[PDB]
Ligand code: SF4
């Protein structure tokens with residue numbers, strides 16, 4: 001057909017819209033119905049289109065992804081597991097992005113300089129492993145992984161998996177981009193079929209057009225409030241409707257990005273002209289031209305069935321701000337000042353932060369700059385502290401050039417390195433003591449306890465870049481930009497005009513400096529050195545095979561009550577320093593979960609010594625003494641981030657099974673990958689029948705089978721037993737992972753030794 005290349009760095013890897021078409025076709029003959037946009041792109045990528053059992057929400061699809069992307073906080077451990085496989089080269093186009101380890105303190109190029117010193121050991125590891133197995137490397141400073149992917153690797157009809165839960169951002173350019181854990185990326189780097197549970201499809205119909213202060217963020221802040229953090233589990237959100245064409249291409253990225261906060265498998269928009277337009281401005285107009293030739297397969301079939309439909313009228317949606325400690329608690333910016341007052345949330349804003357992969361684009365910076373110059377014209381500057389993060393070198397270089405970075409600096413903002421920064425708590429923040437109650441408003445996406453500054457009493461609210469700027473100029477949550485009046489230097493009252501700005505540079509993009517480094521695909525005769533006395537990197541030892549017997553007399557490490565995020569299971573911020581060292585990082589295991597016994601964080605009773613103390617230390621004592629343990633959890637356990645450390649770390653400290661009401665998808669797949677048993681209650685009221693002092697026997701592991709549940713004998717200390725039933729979603733692929741010890745120990749047996 002045509003020979004159009006996947007990117008500017010892989011001139012020999014072509015887009016295969018001919019193969020997408022071939023398979024879409026084979027499949028709609030078996031099914032005889034309209035296919036939605038995500039069914040087309042997902043099923044066009046099946047390993048066996050003719051024989052694959054397709055049932056939404058029931059069957060497991062064996063898929064073939066087109067490329068793998070890694071950020072440096074999860075790449076370390078994906079590559080250390082790749083090194084253990086023994087495979088010589090990655091089998092699909094893969095990238096490493098160094099965005100997570102650059103701490104905010106001084107601003108801009110000072111922090112970058114300091115990050116390169118402090119973390120050299122790590123960047124060195126990734127760079128060398130990169131050159132050796134054929135993975136491209138984007139150096140520190142390059143940008144946040146999702147801006148670099150939308151700018152360079154994302155295209156209509158791509159199936160891309162990334163080791164980061166915000167990978168759905170790519171749906172803004174018509175692809176299926178799905179977040180996974182390091183062991184899932186190893187399968188595809190190694191050449192085996194990837195499995196995904198067939199999703200349901202929620203359709204959102206957009207209507208009207210966005211006006212004034214309303215922007216792309218408000219649509220996903222309202223869908224999160226409506227569907228809640230557990231609403232999208234097991235479904236792809238498919239956007240459609242007449243109002244789609246009024247949203248920019250980076251606006252659509254904003255909305256697919258934050259679909260992660262409702263647990264969606266991903267989100268996607270259909271190929272339209274705003275996408276075409278953006279591909280051409282990012283030098284990929286040949287791709288724009290080929291997607292027009294394949295257009296029918298990049299839009300939904302007429303009359304397709306959604307399992308749920310929601311409709312939003314863009315012309316009626318007004319500004320929103322979500323939180324304080326969940327992103328689905330939605331308020332409008334018009335009563336947030338009253339609900340905080342009533343609810344005892346701090347009213348004065350200490351810091352305002354625009355950035356992160358959800359809101360770091362040229363359009364976001366320009367709409368921001370436009371509230372900022374109105375304030376400047378009347379001689380005002382920020383009452384709050386103001387920080388600004390650019391999405392990539394290219395956005396940074398271009399907003400510098402078009403004048404926006406200096407308006408943002410003249411109102412009183414500091415520009416930080418092109419990196420996550422304060423968003424995974426890599427902030428050296430010093431305006432508050434620890435435990436001081438305060439309010440910070442961000443244009444980010446999550447606002448979980450202690451996530452931005454390790455201070456559990458920080459009240460964080462998420463909103464849009466232009467509203468964070470209005471509220472930072474004012475310093476108070478009691479300020480509606482639409483109604484109220486500021487006071488200038490002049491002596492007069494003025495009101496803010498709604499921001500206006502271009503979706504993309506009038507000129508072409510200024511690309512900044514060279515941050516990419518291609519694999520030498522010649523040399524590769526590098527050794528990767530991991531110091532044997534290193535505190536940041538450590539090679540892995542395999543886990544044990546299953547013994548062939550049931551799990552009698554299991555100790556309960558903790559029964560968790562309430563919300564339990566992977567930011568609670570394995571904290572980030574200062575702990576990012578140990579993302580290549582399993583033993584050292586295992587010392588944050590569960591320190592933020594609330595124990596039901598005493599309502600406290602990191603304080604559990606050691607069964608033997610009967611003293612109360614830290615969760616990691618009690619799990620090490622149980623492991624030292626031979627006691628096999630379990631965790632008991634509530635609903636939507638493992639919510640949030642995709643980091644596999646939350647499943648590797650209970651395996652290293654002796655954990656055996658985790659039992660909950662429900663699981664979040666990516667954490668449940670990561671638990672089965674590492675040899676653990678994720679199990680749910682067949683009746684959720686049984687959670688109330690298990691007390692912290694009971695012992696549990698999981699039984700019938702010997703004839704473990706898909707569809708057949710497991711029995712759990714709850715041994716109460718008085719001599720009262722009780723049998724309850726536990727369901728699992730394992731298919732037979734997955735049961736071989738468990739019997740072997742981990743997915744990786746299974747993969748190594750298959751290499752004929
Ligand atoms: S959500 Fe924050 S930490 Fe996770 S990728 Fe986006 S900017 Fe980086």
Ligand SMILES: [O]
Nearest residue numbers: 164165166167
């Ligand atoms: O993320």
